[PDB]
Amino acid sequence: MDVDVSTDGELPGAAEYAREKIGRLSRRAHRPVLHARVRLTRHGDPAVERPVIAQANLDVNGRQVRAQVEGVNAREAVDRLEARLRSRLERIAEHWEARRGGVPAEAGREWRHESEPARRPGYFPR
Amino acid sequence: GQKINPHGFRLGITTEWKSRWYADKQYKDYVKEDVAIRKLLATGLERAGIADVEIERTRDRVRVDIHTARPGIVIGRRGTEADRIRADLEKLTGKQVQLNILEVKNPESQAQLVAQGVAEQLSNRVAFRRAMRKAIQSAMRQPNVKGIRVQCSGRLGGAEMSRSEFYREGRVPLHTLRADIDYGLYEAKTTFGRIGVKVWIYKGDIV
Amino acid sequence: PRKGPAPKRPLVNDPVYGSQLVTQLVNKVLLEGKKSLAERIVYGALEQAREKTGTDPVVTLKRALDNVKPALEVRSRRVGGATYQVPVEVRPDRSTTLALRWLVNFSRQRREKTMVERLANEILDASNGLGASVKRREDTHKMAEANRAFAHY
RNA sequence: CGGCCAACUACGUGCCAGCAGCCGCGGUAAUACGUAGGGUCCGAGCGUUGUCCGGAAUUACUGGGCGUAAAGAGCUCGUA
RNA sequence: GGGAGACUGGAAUUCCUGGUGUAGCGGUGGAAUGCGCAGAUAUCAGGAGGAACACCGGUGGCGAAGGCGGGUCUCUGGGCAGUAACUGACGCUGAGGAGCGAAAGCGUGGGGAGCGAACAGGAUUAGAUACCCUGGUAGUCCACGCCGUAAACGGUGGGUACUAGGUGUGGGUUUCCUUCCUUGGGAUCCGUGCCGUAGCUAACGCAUUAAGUACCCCGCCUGGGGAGUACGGCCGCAAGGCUAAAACUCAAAGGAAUUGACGGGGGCCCGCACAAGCGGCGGAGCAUGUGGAUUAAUUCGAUGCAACGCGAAGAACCUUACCUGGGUUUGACAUGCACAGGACGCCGGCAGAGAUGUCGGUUCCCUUGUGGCCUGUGUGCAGGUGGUGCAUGGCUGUCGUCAGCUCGUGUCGUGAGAUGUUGGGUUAAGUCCCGCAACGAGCGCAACCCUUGUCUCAUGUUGCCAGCACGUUAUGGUGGGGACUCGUGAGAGACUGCCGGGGUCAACUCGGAGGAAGGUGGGGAUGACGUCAAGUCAUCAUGCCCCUUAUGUCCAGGGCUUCACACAUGCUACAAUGGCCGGUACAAAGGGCUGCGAUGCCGUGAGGUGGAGCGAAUCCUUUCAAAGCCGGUCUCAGUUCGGAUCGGGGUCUGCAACUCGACCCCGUGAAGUCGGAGUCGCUAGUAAUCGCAGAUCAGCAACGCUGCGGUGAAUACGUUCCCG
């Protein structure tokens, strides 16, 4: 997994840490990752309690996955971003194991939006 | 960016241009001298409420008409104010410039004057709720006023957090083209920054 | 098409042949709005067919259309959270559209050095039942038949 | 001397140095830190710490509760 | 169906045996392990064994609770009703204690069909110690004993008396309709549900079966973790159960209900959202923007939709904010306080890269107090594209042109709040109608505005020319003329107006006539309350902070154009629906004064000379196009495709094209054979394709942006899926 990091201003070593942390998420993605971008920014105002902002974007086989966090320094922001991305990838899975509980089951028990409608005869049962 | 300027929405329909002349080669320098005149009058006079300034030009002679709520303040009894404005308008390369000082009939029905008063009250010490309530009541007391909305935003009360507040009374149909909406904006100078006051006044419709 | 069907365009009859089908054909071969070139191509192909066989061109064009017109097609259907290739009956208009599109495309990938010649050869072989469009109809019917188990829904 | 709870401004500092009974205040414009003006409460005293009672109906005799907030023994028989 | 014991019935599963009988069976979302070909599955007959008892069968019965239904027989417990014969307060509760107590588990001995922890494979998965599949041992069953726990719940201890009713249903006694068949109906006693008063409760709710009103007795609680844990003890074969702390730590942990948001919850709807199509992007070359790296500097800002042909509607110098170096400080530019003046200012010379410095020539008008100019000396001060868009104003994007967002009074609730705004129908729409503890109102929706499609009146120049005359080829060119276009003023015209049918006779809806146009005709402008501390202190303004011999300011040169790469938007192609050559026909819109610039002449061509006429319905942009049509040639090739790159030669703008412009000529002739995963736009004059014009602008990096017209398709069955 190849990641490009577009930082700004002063954030020494943030790029390497972010690359190494984010690149570990490829195995979690159930489909090949086409692109991955990370941006690190810092807030100019000292009054901001969490100045560093980290954002990510992954192209998981055409599905866009993005997250954004805030932290007090580069390392914390990158770690929180990794956590958020992992959660998103978990919720995105869409393979069989991820949609086996949502497929309608039974015959008459339970009803869902895509549940098969019951077949009805022309004449009333009586 | 939410709402376009009400004057510009009805420029060709209800409202009218504030500068009346025709120029083809000399459009650019005419515009330059007009904006110079406007900024000079804005800076020089602040006490009397300057609601509007019109400029008319015809070859050499230039006619500038202004509307104020206190004409006596801006005019010299011996012409001293008139002398000063005349001389420094000649200095604006206006060739022959003549002035027609006028007065507005109902200062409380004019949006620019209302905003000026609200902002002036806001600047010194007044709580903004008091100013908005007073302006709204005074305007609605007038006969032709069918609806007034006052909105001011900024560091209200010297707070660290900016806020936007507005009160409305009656009907203010901003989307209706024929309805004439008088719009006035003026900035309040406070020690903590700048507070902007916008006023919309609706008085019937013109067909 | 969420709020209901949309009206169809009533294209006019051709002047020099008087048939709806040739206008449909020229609109199928049309590219970039150059309608005159499309009409020239179609008329040239029809005249080539008439010269080769010796009879009216519209009758052989209709014969080719009937030879390549499909009747059963397959569409992916999602019933109860599962997708399958379900054979579906084809309406007459969609069958004519599919036949014309197949004819035009498969003539576009012929090797006769000119589109008029390619089109004429394709329509002639479709009339005689040897075109690649005829083949394509054969595979589409075969695929529709091979999935007949799913026709119940 | 932010509110409880009488009594507010300026300067210095800036998530530091520090304060704090609780809530919580320090991120170059702090009525909460430090210092000066001003003020308030007491006054030969004024504050802090320690201990007991009150507030606490928070062991409820006066004067509480037990469906879901803590609280009906798993259910009976039967001794004092 | 209260319990215990004994005996016993049938269906089905499994297995075994024997026929018939073949090649699959089994299992899943889809498969594979597995079984079978040595005769499986299927079908028939026979046999063995174990376990559970379909229908009856329920919110129905019984039991103190756990719990209890195949049939029969034996033994046995409790309840209820009536009579009221009997005893005569013998009642209630109950610390400890004793007994019973689902399932799992434990011991000994049997049994073992099905199911099935553990355990094996198969599959899914990034990984599956799981869910799914195939097998399968304890166990489930019986006898006799242990254990002593459960969401052992009505999360509601037992006894008693009292406090509106209505309606189901189980058991029993009785009066009257009386057929006396009939839940006929009533009354009464004992159960078991539902709904509902008063009352109670924080609320939810309970409510004669109380969680109401009271009396008697018992058990238990005293903030959350630590912890039902350690230690000690008792019980147990064991598993473990019962009794049961503290240190330390937190300022909460909790219950009910409200408004949002969300759901791999449900319902109803929408949108190029999908589906049906057409054309693309992702591959190549180039243009442009960005990241990264590099550099003295590569100025700054913009990072999903909503940053990335964006601020930039024009970076060679300027711009320019960056770097190197050279100067300057009340300063490049303002205004005020002072001292001295008649010069400031220009014009030429020289030095310097220039800023600048120096030299030569010219010198104020007021009017006596000094005013305008600057000098220096100063002094307040100017000046910052310096910082913070998380201090702000203004301006803007976005959800979204979506239909929604609120208020007054009233009512309900302890309160947060609710109602209106929900329900049925309808619409593009909180659009409307009917209902309705609501009645109204406001911002939104719609309309009013622009353009476009038809017609009428007015109207004739620079615009038309049909009928008349003059024309010379060169044509409305010219005299003339309102007729037809056209230009621009006014007006008419679409309002479900009319008809027929559905409709609550209501909204609304379908069809038809008339009409240029039919049902908001087409397209614009118009963007509610708010959200995202969205963007912008670099248009501007601005609080605070900072610089002030510098972060201000002047100049020359350089940079913003660097390039191993990555991303994004485009253009040109990969050709015959085409390339090249010749001929030839049809537009709209717009621009033009130190600008457009024609005829002519000179070049091959950019272009050069020259300047007619034009502030322009007149002249120029050619009279305006290209795709188109006709003719000729090329013959499927890395080509007569493609044009990149490179060599040489020029033109123009500009002080100046080295870094770093555009264009022209000759030569050169790269990749590229229709582009993986994936992804984008578009519903009709639309997509595709063709040309023209404008802004910025001396020139241009423009293939970008904003407009204009030419030619002009395919497809939509329908909302299951993706997105909002």
Side-chain angles (χ1 to χ4, degrees), chain A residues 1-125, chain B, chain C:
Chain A
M1 202 201 158
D2 226 301
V3 178
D4 69 78
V5 198
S6 76
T7 164
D8 74 283
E10 66 304 329
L11 273 154
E16 290 76 52
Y17 193 78
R19 172 193 325 308
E20 165 260 300
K21 284 306 180 117
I22 294 319
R24 294 194 330 211
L25 285 158
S26 181
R27 6 139 20 245
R28 208 60 62 93
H30 306 280
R31 321 297 267 120
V33 169
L34 314 179
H35 194 41
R37 97 181 207 95
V38 185
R39 174 139 176 106
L40 278 306
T41 109
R42 192 164 138 75
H43 268 94
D45 186 24
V48 189
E49 71 296 335
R50 326 267 283 287
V52 183
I53 286 200
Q55 331 159 359
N57 246 308
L58 321 178
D59 201 350
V60 187
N61 216 46
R63 215 151 177 187
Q64 300 302 134
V65 166
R66 78 265 299 171
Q68 185 172 336
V69 299
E70 314 86 356
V72 297
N73 51 263
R75 273 226 325 165
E76 188 221 340
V78 168
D79 283 324
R80 298 199 185 259
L81 183 62
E82 184 201 354
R84 238 109 126 120
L85 271 194
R86 185 234 94 235
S87 76
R88 301 247 43 205
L89 290 173
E90 259 166 39
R91 284 197 235 275
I92 259 297
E94 210 255 352
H95 61 238
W96 169 249
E97 262 295 333
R99 72 209 183 60
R100 75 177 300 286
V103 161
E106 292 133 327
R109 276 320 97 220
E110 286 203 350
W111 167 256
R112 277 229 199 248
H113 194 329
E114 324 188 29
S115 200
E116 203 165 86
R119 297 309 199 72
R120 303 215 144 286
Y123 223 135
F124 166 81
Chain B
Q2 318 277 50
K3 315 157 182 160
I4 75 162
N5 155 277
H7 199 298
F9 194 35
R10 302 135 181 128
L11 194 37
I13 309 103
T14 303
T15 67
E16 294 318 306
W17 284 271
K18 295 159 193 168
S19 181
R20 285 90 141 284
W21 38 263
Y22 184 122
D24 61 307
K25 280 300 173 196
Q26 55 274 12
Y27 204 99
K28 193 180 48 90
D29 50 2
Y30 268 43
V31 162
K32 177 187 137 202
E33 94 164 319
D34 280 24
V35 308
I37 277 177
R38 298 239 191 204
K39 66 203 317 297
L40 158 75
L41 288 206
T43 310
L45 321 172
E46 306 232 5
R47 288 79 54 209
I50 315 300
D52 169 324
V53 168
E54 282 105 334
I55 298 116
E56 281 69 55
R57 203 162 291 98
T58 279
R59 281 178 318 283
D60 188 292
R61 77 114 202 81
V62 176
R63 171 205 206 191
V64 45
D65 316 348
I66 74 150
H67 301 111
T68 169
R70 301 98 148 274
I73 311 197
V74 315
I75 194 57
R77 72 296 307 131
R78 333 166 202 170
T80 320
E81 286 104 281
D83 215 335
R84 172 243 315 181
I85 62 100
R86 280 318 184 75
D88 89 319
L89 277 169
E90 315 312 318
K91 271 301 307 302
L92 283 198
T93 65
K95 306 158 300 312
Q96 183 74 24
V97 28
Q98 87 80 13
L99 170 81
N100 289 188
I101 181 49
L102 312 171
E103 157 68 89
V104 316
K105 309 311 155 290
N106 300 72
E108 308 293 334
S109 100
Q110 227 292 335
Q112 194 61 46
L113 307 174
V114 170
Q116 235 172 323
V118 172
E120 171 267 354
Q121 266 151 86
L122 227 62
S123 170
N124 41 65
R125 288 295 143 226
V126 182
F128 48 103
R129 335 261 198 181
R130 264 283 200 260
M132 272 103 96
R133 268 303 116 169
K134 193 56 64 190
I136 277 192
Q137 300 259 59
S138 166
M140 281 294 216
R141 257 203 311 287
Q142 311 294 339
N144 39 321
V145 173
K146 223 154 279 305
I148 169 174
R149 165 177 165 152
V150 178
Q151 182 219 301
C152 47
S153 61
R155 304 177 50 176
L156 302 164
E160 199 254 298
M161 254 304 199
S162 208
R163 287 145 52 202
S164 274
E165 302 265 10
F166 89 99
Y167 316 113
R168 45 134 308 272
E169 282 277 271
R171 298 194 16 100
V172 188
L174 289 191
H175 279 53
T176 287
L177 265 155
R178 60 194 159 167
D180 48 294
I181 300 309
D182 183 18
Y183 176 59
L185 162 72
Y186 170 107
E187 275 188 307
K189 317 193 161 186
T190 97
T191 88
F192 294 89
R194 189 69 38 114
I195 303 315
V197 199
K198 308 183 171 179
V199 170
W200 299 266
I201 297 189
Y202 164 78
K203 36 169 71 52
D205 35 15
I206 288 120
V207 188
Chain C
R2 208 146 217 174
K3 258 187 209 74
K8 287 239 188 310
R9 306 232 153 67
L11 43 61
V12 84
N13 249 8
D14 192 65
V16 292
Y17 287 77
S19 90
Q20 204 60 346
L21 207 147
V22 293
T23 95
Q24 276 212 48
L25 186 52
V26 309
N27 284 354
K28 284 276 180 311
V29 312
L30 171 56
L31 283 183
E32 296 152 43
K34 312 233 215 180
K35 198 145 197 166
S36 299
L37 165 62
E39 290 153 323
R40 255 159 52 225
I41 284 176
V42 153
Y43 294 163
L46 289 161
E47 294 305 326
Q48 255 209 37
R50 174 191 258 133
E51 281 325 282
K52 174 57 66 64
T53 88
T55 163
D56 162 280
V58 165
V59 292
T60 150
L61 160 63
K62 261 155 182 90
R63 229 204 325 285
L65 239 271
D66 296 309
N67 268 259
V68 304
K69 208 186 271 215
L72 227 46
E73 77 165 8
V74 154
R75 313 203 291 128
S76 284
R77 207 66 71 75
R78 320 197 72 261
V79 182
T83 328
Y84 354 75
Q85 313 275 357
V86 173
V88 186
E89 145 86 345
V90 197
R91 330 178 283 99
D93 322 66
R94 210 193 135 71
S95 53
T96 50
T97 300
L98 285 186
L100 284 177
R101 173 187 318 156
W102 289 344
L103 270 187
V104 177
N105 288 10
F106 284 117
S107 31
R108 287 189 181 146
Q109 315 118 300
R110 295 293 295 279
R111 315 274 342 161
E112 276 88 311
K113 200 147 300 309
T114 319
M115 176 75 192
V116 47
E117 194 159 40
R118 297 191 286 259
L119 191 51
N121 284 22
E122 191 66 29
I123 169 152
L124 287 196
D125 308 21
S127 299
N128 310 133
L130 304 318
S133 29
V134 192
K135 173 257 309 154
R136 142 94 81 200
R137 167 178 141 286
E138 295 309 316
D139 320 64
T140 189
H141 273 203
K142 218 153 307 310
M143 169 78 107
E145 181 77 2
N147 300 268
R148 200 174 194 285
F150 299 133
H152 60 299
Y153 59 51

